[PDB]
Symmetry: C4
C-alpha cells in the first residue's frame, strides 16, 4: 500500500460517458433521505465515494424547513460509496458547513470547517483521527473547496479562503501530510479572487479551476507546486466562460491574467482542465440562473483568450431543469489518469416555493476515449407532489 | 486472484432445487423498497448478487405511478447480495435502462445503457471505474442482455442489439478486457433476430439462448468463440418452444436454423442449455401472456426439431400467478459448473390495475444432481391491500 | 482457514449469564421489522449470527395477518449478526419453512426445506452455492432442527424427520461434506419420536436433545458417531422433564429408554446437555403452555430417571410472559467449549388476539464459570398499543 | 495484531477541535432512531465507534413513553462506527443498563451489566464471545463507567461500584485478560465515593477521573497500577470543580485529598486529565443543571487546590442548551496519545415536557496542538414540533 503519485499521462478524452446518478429527491418522497448540499465525489484506489454537507435532518422531517441557510451547527460531512443514496445508516465523518476530502493511497484525509462565521475552525482528520486544526485568519467565513483535495507522494494540498465574498479576500494553500499541516503558502500571481476550487493531479504538481465571486465571470486557475510550495495563478483564457452569471456567448469576453469585469459578481463552483492548448469545461446552460448543464471542448481555449471555437458539446442536464455546483475528480486507470465530473441538481427554496426545504441530488459523468450519444439526466422529482 | 475460465464440465442435472426468494412486493407494503424490473443474478467466486434496473423510485412513493415505462433518465442498475431486498442502502452501480454484468474472477464488469432512444450510450465500467463507452450504431434503442455476461481468461463477452424490434436488426458481440473493448464481431449465422441473450460459459466458448422478437417463437442460439472472435447462430431445435407468445404443445413446431413463424412476433427473455443432445429449458405456462413458469428436459431437444418428449417438469410458479423475464447464470463448484436461473415476478401495470406502479420480485432455482419435490413459489402480494 | 474439530473439553458451567437480546417486537411498533419464528443462533469462528424463518412480510404490513401459519412459500431463512434486528437490510439465505445452519470453520452450510407438504425439498447450500438436494422420503412434512447443525473435521451432520406428528415417523441423520450428502443413516435405538433436535459437539461426536411430539414429555437424546455413521438413541433420564406440555413437578417421571407416556402429545423445541452425570436444561416454567422460561441443573439428571434434585435455578422469562422455542449452540473458548442457548419469545396469535400477526423476539444466554444474579428479560412489547 | 500499551507521550494540547456530531434526535423526527442514553466513544487501532444504552425502542414508537427510567430489561448496549447514528441496522452488542467498552488491540471487550436492582449480573464479552461474569457484591445497583475502559499489554481494567448512591459504597477495580477477570483490587486511598470513571492510559498505568454522588463537587481521581494491581486515590485539586451540582466560581473550593463538602450530593459523569501540574477539564456551564458545556485549562490545577486560574476556555454547548454526561477517550497518533471527549446532549423528560420520551444526541471533540475558533453545537432538535 503505497502513496499515490498520479505520475501517468492524462487519458485521451472525446467527451464524457454516464457514470452514476443517485435519484436522491425522488427517493425522499417515499423513504428517509438526508437533506444535503455542496455534494462531491472522490475515490480511493478501489472505488469512488459520494460526499455532501448534511443539514442534520432527513427530508420528510420537520427540521427540513429552512435548509436554504448554508451555515448551521448541525451540518455534517456525509460519506457513502458512490451510488448509495444518503440513507440513515450513512456515516457522518465530521462537523462541517464547508469541506474537502482526498485519499493519498493509504488513508482518507478530511478537511472540515465548522463554527461561528467570524471565528471558524477547520479540522484535519486523517486515517480516522483528528491530526491538526487551524483558526480562521481573516475572521470572515473561512471556507474550502467543496470538492476533492489532491495528494502526491504523501503530501495533500487544499485551497482555503478567508475573507470577503466580493472584495479582496485572503486565500491560502495548505500542504497536509498525514493530517499535519506541514506548510502554508499564500495566494500569489494574478487571480484576484478564489473560491471553491476544483483541483486535480497534473504530475508533478496540482492544478485548480476555481470560482471568482468578485469581478470575474471567467474562472481563476491556480497552480500548486508540491515540492517547493510555490504558487502561480491566472485565469481560464477561453472566450467561452465557465461562470454563472455571465454574458451571453456573443457578448462575452475573457483574459488570460485578470477578471473579465463582465457580470463578475456572484458565481458557482465549476471545473475545467487543459488538453494541450484546448480546454474541456462544463457550465450551466443558462447564463444568469442555475438551470441546465452542458460540457464542451474549446479549441485553443487554454492559451487563446480570443478563441470561442467549441467542439464536442454534450447536454448533461437540459436547460429547463435545475442544476447547481459541479467539480472535477480524477480516477487512475491502468495507463492513464481519467478526469470525471459530478453535477449538483438543486431543488427547493428559494427558486421553487412548492416546498419549504432545499436539497440536492447528483449525477456523474466520466471522460472517455470511446463514443457516446446524447440524452438529459436531470433530478427527476415532482415537487408539486412532495411531502407537505 | 486469478481470471475465471470455467474450464470444468457441466454438472449432472436431474432438475432444479429452490435457492432464493426476495419477497420484494409484499415487503414494500410495509417498508421502503425500490421499484424495479428486468432483474438478474451473477456471482463472483464467493457469492451471488441480485441486479435490477431500478426506476429511480421506491414503491410507496408518488413517483411510482407510470413505472410501466421502460426507458427513463432515472433508471439505474441496482446491486445487492442475493437475498437482500432492494432497500434504501442498495448501491446503484451505474445509470442504465438496459444492462449486463459479470465478474472475470478479479473484478466486476458492468455494461450500462442510458440516453436518448435514437442516440444511446453504453458505458463500460470495470473494477469501479469507467473504461470505455460506445454510441448507438443504428440509432434505434441500443440494448443488451438483461442477464449476466460471461468472462473467460479475462475476456468478457456481451451481446448488444440496435434496430427494429420487429424486422431485421443490428446485433453485435463485444469482447471486453478489463473494461476495454478489444473487438466488435457482428452477428453471423442463421439467427434472424436476437435480443436479451442468456449466455453461459461452455469451455472454451460461450453460448447464448436469446429472444427472437420478430418471426420466431423458438429461441435463437448464438455461439461465441472467445479466441478468434467468430460467431455462428441458429435456433433451439426442440418442438416445445421457449418463447411467449407461442402456440400449444400439439400445434407448435420448430427448426434448427430458422424462425418457426408461429406467433413469433413479440417475446420474452428466457433461457435454455444443452445436456448432450437434450435440452434443459424453462418457459411461461400460459402460451400468450406471461403467467406461470415451468422447467423441463426435452429428450433430443438440442438436435431433433421433431422431438416433443419432455421429462422432469417442475412448476416453479403455478399457472395462475404472474411471471416475467428469466435468465440463466452459472456457478463453479469443486468439480464442475452448475447452471441456475432466476424468474422475474412482474406485478402491477398494465395487466393489473388495482395499483399504479409496475414492479417485480424474484425467485432463483439452482441445478442439482440430487433429488427434489414439488411446490409453487409465486410473488404472493395482495394488490387489493397495497398503497393508494 | 481450518476445519473445526471442537476437540476441547466442555467448560465448567455454574449457570448462565446474559448475552444478547434483540427487542424485535418493540422496535416494530416504530420501525420496519421482519415477521419471524423458529429463531436460532450459530457462530462462525469469530462471531455469532442469529437466524429466523421470516414470513415474507414486515410487522407493520398488510401481509402480516395470519402469520400463525408455519408453512408458506414466502418463508425465507434470515441471517443477521447476533443483536442486529431483522431490518429490511437483512439477508435471506434460502427459501425455507424449516432450516438448520452451521459453519464448518471454512464456510456456512444451510439446510433449507421448502415446497409442498406431501412433497417438500431440502436444499444444501455451502459457501454461497447450492450443492445438493433431497426429496421428502415419506411425503409428510419433511422437517429439520430449527437450530444449529454441528461439523467435525469438515463433516457436518443434521437430523431430519418425515412422517406423523402423532405416531411413528421416519427420522434420518445426514452427513454433509462441503454441501454434499455423503451419507444418510436412519434413526436407531430407543427414541420413539423425534423432532427439532438441539444438537451440540461432544468430541469425538455429536449429541442432540430433541422433541418427542408423540408419547413423551421427557426428551429424546440422539448420539451420532461422526466417523462410522452409527446412531444410538434414548431419553433424558432426569425425573424433572423438559418438554411442554408435561405433568407438574410432583407428579412427573422419566425413563432412560422409553417415552414417559405422560401428557406426551405435542411438545416444544428445547435443549439439554450433560455435565458428568448431571444435566443442565431449560424448559418453560408453566407445565402446560409456553409461558416463562427457567434453567437448572439436575443432580444425577443424566443417569437417574428418579432424580428430582435441582440446584442452580435461574428464571430467564417470568411465568407471566410468553416464551416458546429454545435451543443450544456451542462456542469455542481458548481452552474449552462453552454451551449457550437462545429462547424464542413468541407474541400474537393464537393466544393474544389484540393483534392479527404472529411474530417473535429473542433473548440469548451463555454458560459462565463465574458468578451471576437474577432477573427477567421478556419481550416487553405492548400489544394493546401495537399497529392495529 | 499486537496488544496496545500506549507507551507514548501525551500530545501537546492547546484545546479542542470539533470531531463529530450525530444529530440523532433531529433525525428521529423523520427516521427510525434508537432511544438512548449514557453514550460514549471508544476506538480500535483504525477507527472510532460510538456506544449508547438503548431503551429497547426507537423514538417514534409507542414504547418510547417513560424512557426516563434508566434500568429496564430491554436496555441493550449499542455499537456503530462513529457518526453513523443509531438506526435500525445498529448492532445491540449485549444486554445492559450499565456498561463499559474497550479494544485491547486485538479484539473488543464489553463489560455489560443487567438484571435486578438488588442482584445485577455483569457479563464480560471478549472477541465476540462470553468469557466471564460476576454477581453484584453488595446488592444495590451494581454499576460501571459508561465510558471506555483501558487496556495495556493485554490487561484491561474497569472500575465497578455497588452500594449506596448517597453514602459509603463498595467500589472495585477488575483486571481482565481476554475477557477473564484475572484479579480484583478494592478501592483504596482518599476518595470516598467513586462513580462513572472516565479512564485513560497514562503509561505505565491507568488514570480515571470520576463522579462523587455523595459529599463532593470536586472529582475523584483513581490511579490504577496494572502490574501489581495497586490502587491509590484522591480528588481533583483545582479550585474550579468538575461536578454538577456545585457552588459558583467565586464561592467554590476544592481539596486534594477529601471531598469538598459543597452542594456535593448528586453529580454527573465528567472527565479531566493532567498536563504537567495543570488540568484540562470539562464541565457543564450551569452550576445546578446540565445546561451548557465548556472546557478550559487550569494553571496549577493538578496540584494546587487553591488555584482558580483558567486559561483557554472553549464553549462546546451554549449555556441555554442542554448537555448531560461527558467522558474522555484516547487516540494513538503517529507520535503521541491524544485525548478527546464526547458530550451527551439529553433531550426530553422530565425537564422538557413537550414529549413523553427521554433521549439524547451527541457531540465529540478531540485534542489539538493547532489553533481553533469558537462556536456552539447543541442537539438542535425542535421538541415543539416533534412526534405527538
Ligand atoms: C449522437 O450524439 C453525438 C455525440 O453527443 C452527437 O454528435 C455531436 O453533435 C454535437 C452538437 O451538434 C457536436 O458539437 C458541435 O460541434 C460543432 C462543430 O461543427 C463542425 O465542425 C467539425 C470540424 O472541426 C466537423 O467535424 C463536424 O462535422 C461539425 O459539423 C460546433 O460548432 C457546435 O457548437 C455550436 O453548436 C452548439 C449546439 O448546437 C451551440 O450551443 C454552440 O453555442 C455552438 O454554436 C457543437 O459543439 C459534437 O462534436 C458531436 N459529437 C461527436 C462525438 O461527434 C450526435 O449529433 C448525436 N446524434 C443525434 C441523432 O442526436
Ligand atoms: C414429487 O416431486 C417429484 C419430482 O418433482 C414428482 O415427480 C415428477 O413428476 C413429473 C410430472 O409428472 C415428471 O415429469 C413428467 O415426465 C413424463 C415422462 O413420461 C413417462 O416416461 C418415464 C420413463 O421414460 C416414466 O418414468 C414416467 O413414469 C412416464 O410414464 C412426461 O410425460 C410429463 O410431461 C407431460 O405431463 C405434464 C403434466 O404433468 C404436461 O403438462 C406436459 O405437457 C406433458 O404432457 C412430465 O414431464 C417428472 O419426471 C417427475 N420427476 C421425477 C424425478 O420423478 C412427483 O410427481 C411429486 N409427487 C407428488 C405426489 O406430487
Ligand atoms: C441472586 O442471584 C443468585 C443466582 O441466581 C441467587 O441464588 C440462587 O437461588 C436459587 C433459587 O433460590 C438457587 O437454586 C435453588 O437451589 C435449591 C437447593 O436448595 C438448597 O439445598 C441443597 C441441598 O440441601 C443445598 O446444597 C443448597 O445449598 C441449597 O441451599 C433448590 O431447592 C431450588 O429448587 C426448588 O425451589 C425453586 C424455587 O427456588 C422451585 O421452583 C423448584 O421447583 C424447587 O422446589 C433451586 O434449584 C440457586 O442455587 C442459587 N444460585 C447460586 C449460584 O448459588 C440468589 O438467591 C439471588 N439473591 C437474591 C437476593 O435474589
Ligand atoms: C476565536 O477563538 C479563539 C479560540 O477559541 C478565542 O481565543 C480564546 O478566547 C477565550 C475567551 O476570552 C480565552 O479564554 C479566556 O482566557 C483568559 C486568560 O486571560 C489572559 O491570559 C493571558 C495572560 O493573562 C493572555 O495571553 C490573554 O490576553 C488573556 O487575557 C481567562 O481569564 C478567561 O477566563 C474568564 O473568562 C470566562 C468568560 O469569557 C469566564 O466564564 C471564566 O470563568 C473567567 O472569568 C478565559 O478562560 C482563550 O484563552 C482564548 N484562546 C486562545 C488560544 O487564544 C478568541 O476569543 C476568538 N475570537 C473572537 C473574535 O471571538
Ligand atoms: C398517474 O399518472 C397518470 C399519467 O401521467 C403521465 O405520466 C406522468 C409521469 C407525467 O408525464 C404526466 O404528465 C402524464 O400524464 C395521470 O393521468 C394523466 O393526467 C394528465 C394530467 O393530469 C391527463 O391529461 C391525462 O388524463 C393522464 N394521462 C394519461 C397518459 O393517461 C394521473 O394523474 C396519475 N394518477 C394518479 C391517481 O395520481
Ligand atoms: C415444520 C413445521 O411446520 N413445524 C411446526 C411444528 C411442528 O408441526 C411440530 O413439531 C409437529 O410436527 O409445530 C409448530 O406448530 C404451531 C402451530 O401449528 C399448528 O399446526 C398447531 O396445531 C397449532 O397449535 C400451532 O401452535 C410448533 O411451534 O409447535 C410450529 C412449527 O413451524
Ligand atoms: C446504573 C444507573 O442507573 N446509572 C444512572 C446514574 C446513577 O443513578 C448514579 O451513578 C448514582 O448511583 O444516574 C443517572 O440517573 C438520573 C435519573 O435517576 C433517577 O433515579 C432520578 O429519578 C433522576 O435523577 C433521573 O434523572 C444520572 O444521569 O445521574 C443516569 C444513570 O443511568
Ligand atoms: C462556505 C459557504 O458558505 N459556501 C456557500 C457559497 C459561498 O457563500 C460562496 O463561495 C461565496 O464566497 O454560497 C452559496 O450560496 C452558493 O453559491 O451556493 C452556498 C454555499 O454553501
Ligand atoms: C431495452 C428495452 O427497452 N427493453 C424492453 C423490452 C424491449 O422493448 C424488447 O426487447 C423489444 O425490443 O420490452 C419490455 O416491455 C418487455 O418485453 O418486457 C421491457 C424492456 O425494458
Ligand atoms: C446578448 O447580449 C445582449 C444583452 O446585454 C443583447 O442585446 C443581445 O441581443 C444578446 N445576444 C444574443 C445572441 O442573445
Ligand atoms: C436564461 O433564463 C431566461 C429566463 O429567465 C431566458 O430569457 C434566457 O434566454 C435564458 N438563457 C438561455 C440560454 O436560455
Ligand atoms: C489465458 O491467456 C494466456 C495469455 O496471457 C495464456 O497463456 C493462458 O494459458 C490462457 N488460458 C488458457 C486456459 O489457455
Ligand atoms: C399436579 O397435577 C395434578 C392434576 O392432574 C394434581 O392432582 C396435583 O395437585 C398437582 N400437584 C401440585 C403440586 O400442584
Ligand atoms: C399455565 O398457563 C395458563 C395460561 O392461561 C394459566 O392459566 C395457568 O395458571 C398456568 N399454570 C401455572 C401452574 O402457572
Ligand atoms: C454564588 O452563589 C452563592 C450562593 O450561596 C453566593 O455565595 C455568591 O454570592 C454567588 N456568587 C456571585 C458572584 O454572585
Ligand atoms: C440554570 O438553569 C435554570 C433552569 O432554566 C435557570 O433558571 C438558571 O438561571 C440557570 N443558571 C445559570 C447560572 O445560568
Ligand atoms: Ca416510514
Ligand atoms: Ca463570478
Ligand atoms: Ca417471439
Ligand atoms: Ca411431548
Ligand atoms: Ca457530587
Amino acid at each position: 500500500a503505497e502513496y499515490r503519485n498520479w505520475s501517468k499521462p492524462q487519458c485521451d478524452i472525446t467527451g464524457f460517458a454516464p457514470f452514476s446518478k443517485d435519484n436522491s429527491i425522488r427517493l425522499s418522497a417515499g423513504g428517509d433521505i438526508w437533506v444535503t448540499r455542496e455534494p462531491y465525489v472522490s475515490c480511493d484506489p478501489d472505488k469512488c465515494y459520494q460526499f455532501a454537507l448534511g443539514q442534520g435532518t432527513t427530508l420528510n422531517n420537520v427540521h427540513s424547513n429552512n435548509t436554504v441557510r448554508g451555515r448551521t451547527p448541525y451540518r455534517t460531512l456525509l460519506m457513502n460509496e458512490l451510488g448509495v443514496p444518503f440513507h440513515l445508516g450513512t456515516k457522518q465523518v465530521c462537523i462541517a458547513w464547508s469541506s474537502s476530502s482526498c485519499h493519498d493511497g493509504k488513508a482518507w484525509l478530511h478537511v472540515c470547517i465548522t463554527g461561528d462565521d467570524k471565528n471558524a475552525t477547520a479540522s484535519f482528520i486523517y486515517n480516522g483521527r483528528l491530526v491538526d486544526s487551524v483558526v480562521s485568519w481573516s475572521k470572515e467565513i473561512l471556507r474550502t473547496q467543496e470538492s476533492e483535495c489532491v495528494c502526491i507522494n504523501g503530501t495533500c494540498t487544499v485551497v482555503m479562503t478567508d475573507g470577503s465574498a466580493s472584495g479582496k479576500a485572503d486565500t491560502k494553500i495548505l500542504f497536509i501530510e498525514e493530517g499535519k499541516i506541514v506548510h502554508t503558502s499564500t495566494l500569489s500571481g494574478s487571480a484576484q479572487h478564489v473560491e471553491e476550487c476544483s483541483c486535480y493531479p497534473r504530475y508533478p504538481g496540482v492544478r485548480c479551476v476555481c470560482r471568482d465571486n468578485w469581478k470575474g465571470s471567467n474562472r481563476p486557475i491556480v497552480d500548486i507546486n508540491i515540492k517547493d510550495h510555490s504558487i502561480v495563478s491566472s485565469y481560464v483564457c477561453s472566450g467561452l466562460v465557465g461562470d454563472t452569471p455571465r454574458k451571453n456567448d456573443s457578448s462575452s469576453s475573457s483574459h488570460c491574467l485578470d477578471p473579465n469585469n463582465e457580470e463578475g459578481g456572484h458565481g458557482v463552483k465549476g471545473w475545467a482542465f487543459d488538453d494541450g492548448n484546448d480546454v474541456w469545461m462544463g457550465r450551466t446552460i443558462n447564463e444568469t440562473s442555475r438551470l441546465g448543464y452542458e460540457t464542451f471542448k474549446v479549441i485553443e481555449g487554454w492559451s487563446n483568450p480570443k478563441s470561442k471555437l467549441q467542439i464536442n458539446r454534450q447536454v448533461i442536464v437540459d436547460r429547463g431543469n435545475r442544476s447547481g455546483y459541479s467539480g472535477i475528480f480524477s480516477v487512475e486507470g491502468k495507463s492513464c489518469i481519467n478526469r470525471c465530473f459530478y453535477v449538483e441538481l438543486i431543488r427547493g427554496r428559494k427558486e421553487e416555493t412548492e416546498v419549504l426545504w432545499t436539497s440536492n441530488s447528483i449525477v456523474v459523468f466520466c471522460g472517455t476515449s470511446g463514443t457516446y450519444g446524447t440524452g438529459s439526466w436531470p433530478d427527476g422529482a415532482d415537487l408539486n407532489l412532495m411531502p407537505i
